[PDB]
Design a protein around this ligand. Structure first.
Ligand code: CHL
Ligand code: CHL
Ligand code: CLA
Ligand code: CLA
Ligand code: CLA
Ligand code: CLA
Ligand code: CLA
Ligand code: CLA
Ligand SMILES: CC(=C/C=C/C=C(C)/C=C/C=C(C)/C=C/[C@@]12O[C@]1(C)C[C@@H](O)CC2(C)C)/C=C/C=C(C)/C=C/[C@@]12O[C@]1(C)C[C@@H](O)CC2(C)C
Ligand SMILES: CC1=C(C/C=C(\C)CCC[C@H](C)CCC[C@H](C)CCCC(C)C)C(=O)c2ccccc2C1=O
Ligand code: SF4
Lengths: 146, 64, 211, 208, 211, 163, 40
């Protein structure tokens, strides 16, 4: 539990950095002394001065959402697994395996994705078929944004 | 003479400039009434790659 | 300037000027700024003067111990011998040591900042005696023997003081790997020099070559 | 104007010919700079002088062993003499490292600054302990006046180097024809003199 | 499908390298240039270099499935131990039934065959278990370069240069963010390396520990 | 003890973990012959493993219910219960080394900038100067407080701002 | 040779020598003194 509360601190302090920067440097930067004349959201100032892609304050908010989701993911992954071990009775699962990252991939993600993935098998289908369909539906929408 | 001496270092006071509160050599000064006569040269480049720029009398001050 | 710690060609930059025990030994150049060189000079004295009066308690007494006149303990275990005594003075000694030194040392700290700065009515009536001739060398503390014009008897104070600072570092290191006192370590190097040394017996190096 | 290692080759520009044992041999362009050249001539001589001093010690013992005296092979001599010695290993090393650090350091600062050790600090010695040249001191290391003549000193420098290059090649020989035969150098000599045509490096069972 | 598309990206870049309707003069701009500008609604990734940078992602998506085709097909229908009664394939011949569904590729190929990699800790195949993870890091790490832009980073360095300047410890070589084309190249490199190295660990650990 | 942690010597799971990790090697050792090199390699690993476990127990470490050693960070509890070498002391072992790297690089930067063409000195270093500073940095905390108390550490509003 | 020494004074060559030093130092300090965690 120690390592995660510190890893959560990485999210809040760096997510704040991205958003604080886009605010204070909203009025002007050395690369763009007058951002205030253009607006909150504009694409760029051109390829000149070495390149000016993603300077506007909108582009700072844009990049922070990736960290917002990463931060809340760590916060939420830590809630679920610590509670599953409690509900299953085997608290020793989290204490010994949450210290190294293969435990998260083996014991939390890979293991608990068994009943879900068999929602629609070639033999039959359970009541969890709607969730496995949605489970891929999100693995697809995520990729289309790339 | 209208302005600073040739070869004299001066400090810039344009807030817009890449060279703000920084020092550079005076290359030349024009005495024909131009608004921005003082030509200054710095060692460090700006973002584009230019190391010179014409500044004004009020925009420059003595070193340090 | 007195002779050089290297006989050959190690030019010093700022030690050509006058100072006591000047042998041109400052590789790291920690005495460049004169204001803090003035501070490190007093540090060499308080460490020098204190270390010498300390080394006697280890040296003058243990010589009498090895000969057998007295049965005093060794310095590595003198502290645990005092407090178990019936008539003892349990550790209000750390704090009283600080309450007593804190009064004197800050009077010395404020002297280096403002030399000769002891006001007229601050102390009871001895305000004049507390004034010093120079920093580190006060007047009214020594009763005799400080009226010569060639005052550099100070060089003896430093060469003796720097030497003692090596002693306690050797006492502490000898008494951490040899397990015995300083004089007992001396009687062995005299009786069997080649066998009792820092290389083979005193484990200061991992030497295990049994062939 | 003088002999060379390969006749007809143009000698380097930096090897003028004043140095002792100069035959225009430096294809790697080492000692092209003055300061490195000032360092290598002193490195060559110590590697020489230690070779002479050492190789003579091997011949003296290996001859005394062949005659009958109790001397071991130059190899595995530090292993059998330490087993039965009152001086442990470690007290013998740092008696050598500590004593050489004095000399090896004084020699360094005569290199970086000639005439510096003759100030008179060390026990009031001034005329001695100041270098005549880079790697050629005098005064105290030349008790016999065998260097106060430039005519007889310049050729002696040529003999110090020629008998030296030869000497530290011989030490490489001892290493090589020990690993092959595992015998003393003198024993390998008497074999070659006994049957020169048959016992050579070809017939040792190694190097083939 | 993946091949006719990968040709479309490269062949389009070739023919439209010299000139297009949007930019009638690309040849004067050169082979690799990031953009002409924000005008015309946007001219980002119009050069022929940026077509190659896109085609690599499709080459990756193409051969990654040519490779999965070879592994599951040969494990299920070809490879296996021959017994007295026929052959016992590694995966029991599940390519016919499960492959028709995408969930089959997720269940019977990925979730199933990843058991040998994940359980490699404490054995000789432990290196593949680590490379399996480190390959994911380098993949995701690429996303910072592809999704972001030079502008945010060059401003951040200015606030960092202030602190390095405040302490009089600053480089004479000014720090500058990476060029636009470099950030794109750095992305696809760390991207492909992490995507390819994962298979290299997923395969060898699966197959060396046969089945 | 503290925080409901047992010492590693008294723990059962700690010894259970030792008997397990040795059993893996003993099974692996059965395959090869006695005098072969694979045998010597595994016996050494066995010797190291036996040494790792006893040394961690001898050092007054604290093992939890899982059987693995835990570290304590507060210097108060570390000094009170004799666990200072774990975290508290290595903190000063690092900072001495880290400040060494800063005091060295800061001096090379300042001194090369006092000459002509400092840009070339970064890509083509002055190795004699770099080694000189690298062996003069043993007492960097003295120079820092010397430079702070003097005032020549920080620059004073001669830096570029943006607005 | 003056130019060879200058090439050896470039950034990556000096960095290579640094890396062999710091890496070989840490490894040999783990070859002997195996498995340190607590510092005595
Ligand atoms: C109101 C707050 C006040 C404070 C915070 C200080 C602080 C200080 N003064 Mg004063 N002073 C203060 C008021 C006054 N001082 C003085 C006059 C002086 C002088 C003349 C000197 C100081 C000095 C000092 C320093 C003493 C440090 C020290 O040893 O402390 C540690 C704590 C103690 C010493 C207290 C110990 C308790 C104690 C007195 C118990 C007494 C009972 C006996 C021990 C019993 C006998 C038992 C036997 C067997 C041992 C320190 C900077 C000295 C200094 O450094 O000057 C530069 C100094 O020389 N002060 C006067 C009169 C004008 C004051 C009037 O208000
Ligand atoms: C300033 C230097 C100084 C040094 C180098 C030492 C060194 C030592 N002291 Mg002190 N002491 C020092 C100052 C002081 N000691 C004491 C009070 C004691 C005691 C009461 C004891 C020591 C003991 C020890 C020894 C073991 C360390 C320890 O605590 O083990 C744990 C060691 C030789 C101990 C000892 O003798 O161990 C055998 C011991 O019992 N020292 C006081 C105030 C009374 C000091 C004030 O400055
Ligand atoms: C400077 C005074 C000094 C003197 C006279 C001695 C003397 C001695 N030390 Mg010692 N020592 C000293 C400082 C000193 N030490 C310091 C500062 C340290 C910590 C680095 C040590 C650490 C140490 C260990 C770890 C051991 C000794 C041991 C010994 C004894 C055997 C000799 C030996 O091992 O080589 C001494 C080795 C050294 C590395 C120190 C020599 C270097 C000094 C600074 C040179 C000074 C020059 C010259 C000797 C001065 C003359 C003074 C004289 C006329 C009074 C001997 C009585 C051994 C023992 O067990 O005793 C029986 C042993 O195991 N010493
Ligand atoms: C370490 C010993 C050593 C050193 C420091 C020197 C140094 C020098 N020699 Mg010298 N030399 C040596 C051994 C040595 N020599 C030996 C053994 C021979 C006989 C084979 C000679 C024969 C010789 C001639 C004929 C001449 C010199 C010259 C020179 C100078 C020119 C610059 C140069 O090449 O030096 C730089 C040297 C080094 C950096 C040493 C590098 C050592 C390498 C790394 C070892 C290589 C191993 C080798 C390939 C295998 C050894 C085994 C082999 C015997 C089979 C310089 C003072 C020339 C000169 O100007 O005269 C004064 C000259 O004309 N030397
Ligand atoms: C620097 C050169 C050098 C070195 C390191 C050695 C080293 C050694 N010599 Mg030696 N020796 C040398 C030159 C050298 N020799 C020369 C030039 C001669 C005369 C030509 C001798 C004549 C000599 C004799 C006669 C004996 C040694 C012996 C020894 C060994 C014991 C040392 C000792 O008694 O204390 C040791 C391996 C002794 C030996 O072999 O061990 C018993 C021995 O009896 N040496
Ligand atoms: C933010 C840093 C931090 C935090 C959260 C703690 C937390 C704690 N310290 Mg601690 N400590 C710290 C830094 C810190 N320390 C530092 C830098 C030092 C100086 C080396 C100390 C020295 C120290 C001592 C000497 C003691 C503690 C103790 C304690 C505990 C009791 C509450 C307390 O401090 O008294 C209340 C504080 C009010 C301001 C608590 C776990 C005590 C302990 O052991 O707890 C059982 C104790 O005796 N600390
Ligand atoms: C042989 C192929 C090769 C390779 C792989 C590299 C690789 C590199 N060169 Mg390069 N170079 C090459 C050939 C090569 N070069 C040739 C032929 C020349 C002409 C002589 C140069 C001339 C050259 C110059 C002039 C410079 C480089 C620099 C660099 C580095 C880029 C700076 C960086 O990212 O670190 C950024 C580093 C930091 C922000 C902080 C310092 C910490 C570093 C990483 C520690 C040292 C790393 C060490 C060198 C790695 C070992 C070498 C490695 C390739 C195995 C990079 C390691 C630059 C550099 O400074 O290198 C370090 C640089 O200025 N190169
Ligand atoms: C935050 C990063 C971090 C930290 C704090 C540590 C800390 C440590 N690691 Mg670890 N490690 C890390 C990252 C880290 N590692 C990574 C990223 C990897 C994968 C590449 C490893 C792989 C690894 C292995 C495989 C081993 C360690 C070991 C160690 C310990 C060795 C101490 C040492 O060198 O002797 C002390 C050295 C000195 C005091 C000398 C330095 C001071 C100079 C001379 C001045 C120490 C607890 C070793 C160990 O014992 O583990 C318990 C070990 O076997 N680590
Ligand atoms: C061959 C050699 C030996 C040094 C050799 C170094 C020597 C000889 C010193 C040795 C120490 C000794 C002998 C002591 C030994 C003993 O102590 C023990 C170990 C054991 C006991 O049993 C006995 C005793 C005697 C006590 C030197 C080789 C260097 C060479 C060829 C350099 C070549 C170059 O520079 C040039 C010329 C120019 C280019 O064209 C080629 C290169 C490559 C660039
Ligand atoms: C992060 C990022 C940067 C900033 C990246 C930079 C400045 C590169 C940083 C390179 C560092 C300096 C290489 C060295 C890294 C480590 C120090 C190497 C380890 C060395 C230790 C072992 C000593 C951009 O400039 C950029 C530009 C355009 C699109 C995207 C991005 C982008 O994503
Ligand atoms: S820098 Fe960005 S906004 Fe500007 S032209 Fe290039 S891609 Fe478009």
């Amino acid at each position: 539990d120690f390592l995660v509360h510190h890893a959560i601190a990485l999210g809040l302090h760096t997510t704040t950095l991205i958003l604080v920067k886009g605010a204070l440097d909203a009025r002007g930067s050395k690369l763009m002394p007058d951002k205030k004349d253009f607006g909150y959201s504009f694409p760029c100032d051109g390829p000149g001065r070495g390149g000016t892609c993603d300077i506007s304050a909108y582009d700072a908010f844009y990049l922070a959402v990736f960290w917002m989701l990463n931060t809340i993911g760590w916060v939420t992954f830590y809630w679920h697994w610590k509670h599953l071990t409690l509900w299953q009775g085997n608290v020793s699962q989290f204490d010994e395996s949450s210290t190294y990252l293969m435990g998260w991939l083996r014991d939390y993600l890979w293991l608990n994705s068994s009943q879900l993935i068999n929602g629609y098998n070639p033999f039959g289908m359970n009541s969890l078929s709607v969730w496995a369909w949605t489970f891929l539906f999100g693995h697809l929408v995520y990729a289309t944004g790339f | 003479e209208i302005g600073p001496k040739r070869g004299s270092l001066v400090k810039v006071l344009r807030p817009e400039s890449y060279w703000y509160n920084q020092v550079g050599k005076v290359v030349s000064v024009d005495q024909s009434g131009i608004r921005y006569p003082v030509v200054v040269r710095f060692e460090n480049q700006n973002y584009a790659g230019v190391s010179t720029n014409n500044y004004a009398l009020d925009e420059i001050e003595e070193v340090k | 300037d007195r002779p050089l710690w290297y006989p050959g060609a190690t030019p010093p930059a700022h030690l050509d000027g006058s100072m006591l025990g000047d042998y041109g030994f400052d590789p790291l150049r920690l005495g460049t700024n004169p204001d803090r060189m003035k501070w490190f000079r007093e540090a060499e004295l308080t460490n020098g003067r204190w270390a010498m009066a300390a080394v006697v308690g280890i040296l003058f007494t243990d010589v009498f111990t090895s000969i057998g006149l007295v049965g005093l303990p060794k310095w590595w275990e003198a502290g645990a011998q005092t407090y178990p005594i019936d008539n003892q003075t349990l550790r209000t000694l750390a704090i009283i040591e600080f309450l007593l030194f804190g009064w004197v040392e800050t009077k010395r700290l404020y002297d280096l900042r403002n030399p000769g700065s002891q006001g007229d009515g601050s102390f009871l009536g001895i305000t004049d005696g507390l004034k010093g001739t120079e920093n580190g060398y006060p007047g009214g503390i020594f009763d005799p023997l400080g009226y010569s014009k060639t005052s550099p008897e100070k060089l003896d104070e430093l060469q003796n003081g720097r030497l003692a600072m090596l002693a306690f570092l050797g006492f502490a290191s000898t008494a951490a790997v040899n397990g015995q006192g300083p004089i007992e370590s001396l009687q062995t190097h005299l009786a069997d020099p080649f066998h009792v040394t820092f290389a083979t017996n005193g484990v200061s190096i991992p030497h295990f070559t049994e062939f | 104007d003088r002999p060379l290692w390969s006749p007809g080759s143009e000698p380097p520009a930096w090897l003028d010919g004043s140095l002792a044992g100069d035959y225009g041999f430096d294809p790697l362009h080492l000692s092209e700079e003055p300061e490195m050249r000032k360092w290598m001539v002193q490195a060559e001589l110590v590697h020489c002088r230690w070779a002479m001093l050492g190789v003579a010690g091997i011949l003296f013992t290996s001859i005394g062993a062949k005659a009958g005296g109790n001397f071991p092979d130059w190899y595995d001599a530090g292993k059998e003499l330490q087993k039965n010695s009152d001086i442990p290993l470690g007290s013998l090393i740092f008696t050598e490292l500590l004593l050489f650090g004095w000399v090896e350091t004084k020699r360094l600062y005569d290199l970086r600054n000639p005439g510096s050790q003759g100030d008179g600090s060390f026990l009031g010695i001034t005329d001695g302990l100041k270098g005549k040249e880079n790697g050629y001191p005098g005064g105290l290391f030349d008790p016999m006046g065998m260097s106060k003549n430039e005519a007889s000193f310049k050729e002696a420098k040529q003999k110090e180097v020629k008998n030296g290059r030869l000497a530290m090649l011989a030490f490489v020989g001892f290493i090589a024809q020990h690993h092959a035969t595992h015998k003393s150098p003198i024993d390998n000599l008497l074999d070659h003199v006994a049957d020169p045509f048959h016992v050579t490096f070809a017939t040792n069972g190694v190097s083939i | 499908f993946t091949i006719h598309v990968t040709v479309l990206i490269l062949l389009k870049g070739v023919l439209f390298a010299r000139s297009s309707r949007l930019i009638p003069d690309k040849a004067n701009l050169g082979f690799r240039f990031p953009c002409d500008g924000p005008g015309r609604g946007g001219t980002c990734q119009v050069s022929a270099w940026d077509h190659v940078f896109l085609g690599l992602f499709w080459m990756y998506n193409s051969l990654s499935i040519v490779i999965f085709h070879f592994s599951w097909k040969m494990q299920s229908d070809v490879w296996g131990t021959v017994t007295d009664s026929g052959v016992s394939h590694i995966t029991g011949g599940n390519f016919a039934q499960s492959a028709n569904t995408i969930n089959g590729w997720l269940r019977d190929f990925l979730w199933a065959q990843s058991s040998q990699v994940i359980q490699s800790y404490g054995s000789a195949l432990s290196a593949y278990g680590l490379m399996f993870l480190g390959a994911h890091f380098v993949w995701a790490f690429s996303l910072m370069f592809l999704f972001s832009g030079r502008g945010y980073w060059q401003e951040l360095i200015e606030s960092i240069v202030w602190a390095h300047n405040k302490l009089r410890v600053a480089p004479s070589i000014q720090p500058r963010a990476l060029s636009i084309t470099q950030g794109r190249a750095v992305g696809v490199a760390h991207y492909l390396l992490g995507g390819i190295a994962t298979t290299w660990s997923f395969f060898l650990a699966r197959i060396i520990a046969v089945g | 003890d503290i925080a409901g942690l047992t010492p590693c010597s008294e723990s059962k799971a700690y010894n259970k973990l030792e008997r397990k990790e040795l059993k893996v090697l003993d099974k692996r050792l059965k395959q090869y012959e006695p005098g072969s090199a694979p045998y010597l390699a595994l016996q050494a690993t066995k010797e190291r493993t036996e040494n790792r476990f006893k040394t961690y127990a001898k050092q007054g470490l604290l093992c939890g219910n899982d059987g693995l050693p835990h570290l304590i960070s507060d210097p108060g509890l570390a000094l009170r219960f004799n666990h200072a070498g774990e975290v508290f002391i290595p903190t000063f072992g690092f900072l001495y080394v880290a400040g060494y790297i800063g005091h060295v690089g800061r001096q090379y930067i300042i001194l090369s900038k006092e000459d002509a063409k400092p840009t070339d000195k970064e890509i083509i270093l002055d190795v004699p100067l770099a080694l000189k500073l690298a062996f003069q940095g043993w007492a960097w905390p003295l120079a820092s407080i010397q430079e702070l108390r003097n005032g020549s550490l920080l620059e004073k509003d001669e830096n570029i701002t943006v607005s | 040779m003056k130019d060879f020494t200058t090439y050896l004074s470039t950034a990556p060559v000096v960095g290579l020598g640094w890396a062999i030093f710091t890496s070989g130092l840490l490894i040999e300090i783990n070859r002997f003194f195996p498995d340190p965690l607590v510092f005595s």
